[PDB]
Design an enzyme around this catalytic site. Structure first.
Site, PDB file in Angstrom:
ATOM      1  N   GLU B 126      12.388   1.657  49.503  1.00 13.47           N
ATOM      2  CA  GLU B 126      13.190   1.091  50.727  1.00 13.47           C
ATOM      3  C   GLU B 126      14.361   1.278  50.039  1.00 13.47           C
ATOM      4  O   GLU B 126      15.733   1.530  50.566  1.00 13.47           O
ATOM      5  CB  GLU B 126      12.975  -0.644  50.602  1.00 13.47           C
ATOM      6  CG  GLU B 126      13.909  -1.415  51.804  1.00 13.47           C
ATOM      7  CD  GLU B 126      13.455  -2.524  51.551  1.00 13.47           C
ATOM      8  OE1 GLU B 126      14.531  -3.855  52.430  1.00 13.47           O
ATOM      9  OE2 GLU B 126      12.550  -3.091  51.067  1.00 13.47           O
ATOM     10  N   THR B 167      14.673  -6.206  51.432  1.00 18.26           N
ATOM     11  CA  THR B 167      14.041  -7.196  51.788  1.00 18.26           C
ATOM     12  C   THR B 167      13.534  -7.960  51.474  1.00 18.26           C
ATOM     13  O   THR B 167      13.323  -9.356  51.940  1.00 18.26           O
ATOM     14  CB  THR B 167      13.314  -7.335  53.214  1.00 18.26           C
ATOM     15  OG1 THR B 167      12.765  -5.662  52.693  1.00 18.26           O
ATOM     16  CG2 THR B 167      14.652  -5.650  54.094  1.00 18.26           C
ATOM     17  N   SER B 226       6.481  -4.714  46.047  1.00 18.29           N
ATOM     18  CA  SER B 226       7.746  -5.367  45.259  1.00 18.29           C
ATOM     19  C   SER B 226       7.450  -6.682  45.159  1.00 18.29           C
ATOM     20  O   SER B 226       8.515  -8.097  44.494  1.00 18.29           O
ATOM     21  CB  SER B 226       9.107  -4.838  45.909  1.00 18.29           C
ATOM     22  OG  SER B 226      10.204  -5.349  45.342  1.00 18.29           O
ATOM     23  N   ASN B 227       7.639  -7.172  46.602  1.00 18.27           N
ATOM     24  CA  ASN B 227       7.219  -8.560  46.617  1.00 18.27           C
ATOM     25  C   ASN B 227       6.400  -9.406  46.280  1.00 18.27           C
ATOM     26  O   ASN B 227       6.551 -10.883  45.998  1.00 18.27           O
ATOM     27  CB  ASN B 227       6.734  -8.667  48.353  1.00 18.27           C
ATOM     28  CG  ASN B 227       5.970  -8.568  49.085  1.00 18.27           C
ATOM     29  OD1 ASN B 227       4.969 -10.091  49.244  1.00 18.27           O
ATOM     30  ND2 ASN B 227       5.234  -7.456  49.467  1.00 18.27           N
TER      31      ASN B 227
HETATM   32  C1  IPE Z   1       8.438  -2.793  53.845  1.00 15.04           C
HETATM   33  C2  IPE Z   1       8.616  -4.266  53.386  1.00 15.04           C
HETATM   34  C3  IPE Z   1       9.886  -5.429  53.929  1.00 15.04           C
HETATM   35  C4  IPE Z   1       7.795  -4.287  52.885  1.00 15.04           C
HETATM   36  C5  IPE Z   1       6.431  -4.588  52.896  1.00 15.04           C
HETATM   37  O1  IPE Z   1       5.941  -4.862  51.445  1.00 15.04           O
HETATM   38  P1  IPE Z   1       4.834  -4.182  50.320  1.00 15.04           P
HETATM   39  O2  IPE Z   1       3.553  -4.449  49.622  1.00 15.04           O
HETATM   40  O3  IPE Z   1       4.249  -3.077  51.530  1.00 15.04           O
HETATM   41  O4  IPE Z   1       6.239  -3.072  50.000  1.00 15.04           O
HETATM   42  P2  IPE Z   1       7.360  -3.870  49.173  1.00 15.04           P
HETATM   43  O5  IPE Z   1       7.099  -5.172  48.767  1.00 15.04           O
HETATM   44  O6  IPE Z   1       7.375  -3.394  47.971  1.00 15.04           O
HETATM   45  O7  IPE Z   1       8.919  -3.307  49.867  1.00 15.04           O
HETATM   46  S1  F3S Z   2      11.167  -6.817  56.114  1.00 15.18           S
HETATM   47 FE1  F3S Z   2       9.311  -5.730  56.570  1.00 15.18          FE
HETATM   48  S2  F3S Z   2       7.564  -5.731  56.217  1.00 15.18           S
HETATM   49 FE2  F3S Z   2       6.752  -7.166  55.705  1.00 15.18          FE
HETATM   50  S3  F3S Z   2       7.841  -8.665  53.928  1.00 15.18           S
HETATM   51 FE3  F3S Z   2       9.477  -8.295  55.432  1.00 15.18          FE
HETATM   52  S4  F3S Z   2       8.515  -8.021  56.738  1.00 15.18           S
END
Ligand code: IPE
Ligand code: F3S
Ligand code: IPE
Ligand code: F3S
Lengths: 309, 310
Positions: B126, B167, B226-227
């Site tokens: 990202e 994000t 990441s999240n």
């Molecule tokens: C595209 C976004 C905003 C992240 C979705 O979760 P993922 O687990 O697939 O990827 P990250 O949390 O590492 O961004």
């Molecule tokens: S920026 Fe987009 S893909 Fe998932 S955690 Fe947030 S919605």
């Protein structure tokens, strides 16, 4: 009160190496240095290192990019190893060469689709690491802790079976498990005897000689130290009152009350300084000079990776 | 042993869309379907789509001419997008609309030749895609991960300075970084707070509530999510043992031994089926019926492009 010392006791070559790897990395790269799981199962050693900057984490997930990660002496599974390799980290493997040796055999059986049986204690990190060397879905990796487990074990092809063992097991109990394996699976293949390392075998031999002379046996080691527990139990097996203690502060007067002979030994992960303090507490409790029993000579040394010297 | 479930948890609108995009393309055009980078950071979702004929590559030069290519939910730099455009390829963008939003602002700043600062983690796709939206040489695009980075940063003209964020960051850590930015660069401009999306904010709020009730926290998510990691961190920082696991098989008995209350949540990219299996495992381990906590409602849904409806 007579104070006897088992020989050999304490630091094995694998433990000495592992500690030196963390200490050196700290000296060479400065704090902090991340270590997955206690480098060795001794709280004094772990606390000491923590105080020097070592950070003991549980999952590689907790390690930041660009950091230095050290695998503990007990070893890790291929998943853990691959996870570390895919991360932006500098990794040093403190796995004892004697555990790595068992790893290679498990990896072999796996590449041959042949099922393998591991004698060991469920939950222990070495067991996870070793069983973690088996991948092939077509084969199988099973754990057995006693003859009973063996009596109930069910495999896919007992014609192509092999076994291995945890390195810190009780020599005697392991022998019983093996006997059961051979009676149940006459075609099973393994080492000449087991995978119990020289250190464990020697320390058990030594504690046996110690106990047949001491009324009370103190084993310096942490509760989560497999080999240390083995030492204490073997002593208690021979009718002697045995105690697993982390340091001198754990000794209770009541324990050596009116005892004419107390024996002291240490697990493979317990530093000699801890023993020295144990003798001091025992002497300020009545004990006389410490007398070291004659014992099997150990000459094995495992050097730190060239990069960390 | 009581089993608690964080609310909300699991799939966000972006993830749900990106997956449906790959699935739909596979159903409309058949396999293979090339995808740049894991569509979402979840091995179960990825291994599955790979089993269904989706080929996950990292570079466009790994894609054959005339093939169908899908950009992952995480987004792509303009370089990659242009490389894709210059090639004979059919492209479908699964980039999360919320990521695209940040992209547009970086692009805007780039046009104005004004410098921008991104708060994020180096190496994450990202971050690569967002940083990749800036191309004006006369300006500048910098990355900072902590206040320490802010303390070392020097810019060309701090009178014309803007910032954006990844994000999926920790709301709390990002707030501290922002504080540093405004003290070092008092005239910097940015969103009202940050670019952390609703889903990331809600899941962190949710795991916080879960943590103050459970002794051990299990976060279902992959190592590279990441999240998901932020969820584990938050709980850990509250004094609770927390583990990031891909599925029930990762659960070690010692983790819940003699634990009276264990909590479970899932990252934005982890399918509920995985949570269901984790609950099953915990239950055969002494846990009872899973108790869902009260939680903020989420009502966002992102539709797949018309060209991919089924
Ligand atoms: C595209 C976004 C905003 C992240 C979705 O979760 P993922 O687990 O697939 O990827 P990250 O949390 O590492 O961004
Ligand atoms: S920026 Fe987009 S893909 Fe998932 S955690 Fe947030 S919605
Ligand atoms: C790495 C090996 C072989 C164990 C060394 O002793 P420890 O006390 O640190 O750990 P265990 O005896 O429990 O295996
Ligand atoms: S396997 Fe290795 S770490 Fe110590 S007791 Fe045996 S040497």
């Amino acid at each position: 009160m007579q104070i006897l010392l088992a020989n050999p006791r304490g630091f094995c070559a694998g433990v000495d190496r592992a500690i030196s790897i963390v200490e050196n990395a700290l000296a060479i790269y400065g704090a902090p240095i991340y270590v997955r799981h206690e480098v060795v199962h001794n709280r004094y050693v772990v606390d000491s290192l923590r105080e020097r900057g070592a950070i003991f984490i549980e999952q590689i997930s907790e390690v930041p990019d660009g950091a230095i990660l050290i695998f503990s002496a007990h070893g890790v599974s291929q998943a853990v190893r691959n996870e570390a390799k895919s991360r932006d980290l500098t990794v040093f493997d403190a796995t004892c060469p004697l555990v790595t040796k068992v790893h290679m055999e498990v990896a072999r059986a796996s590449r041959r689709g042949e099922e393998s049986i591991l004698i060991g204690h469920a939950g222990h990190p070495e067991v996870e690491g070793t069983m973690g060397q088996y991948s092939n879905p077509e084969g199988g990796m099973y754990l057995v802790e006693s003859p009973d487990d063996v009596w109930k074990l069910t495999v896919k092809n007992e014609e192509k079976l092999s076994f291995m063992t945890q390195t810190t097991l009780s020599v005697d109990d392991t022998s019983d498990v093996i006997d059961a394996l051979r009676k149940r699976f006459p075609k099973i293949v393994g080492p000449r005897k087991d995978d119990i390392c020289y250190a464990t075998t020697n320390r058990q031999e030594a504690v046996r000689a110690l106990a047949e002379q001491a009324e009370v046996v103190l084993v310096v080691g942490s509760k989560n130290s497999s080999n240390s527990n083995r030492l204490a139990e073997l002593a208690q097996r021979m009718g002697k009152r045995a105690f697993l203690i982390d340091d001198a502060k754990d000794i209770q007067e009541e324990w050596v009350k009116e005892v004419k002979c107390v024996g002291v030994t240490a697990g493979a992960s317990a530093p000699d300084i801890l023993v020295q303090n144990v003798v001091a507490r025992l002497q300020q409790l009545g004990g006389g000079e410490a007398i070291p029993l004659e014992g099997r000579e150990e000459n094995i040394v495992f050097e730190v990776p060239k990069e960390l010297r």
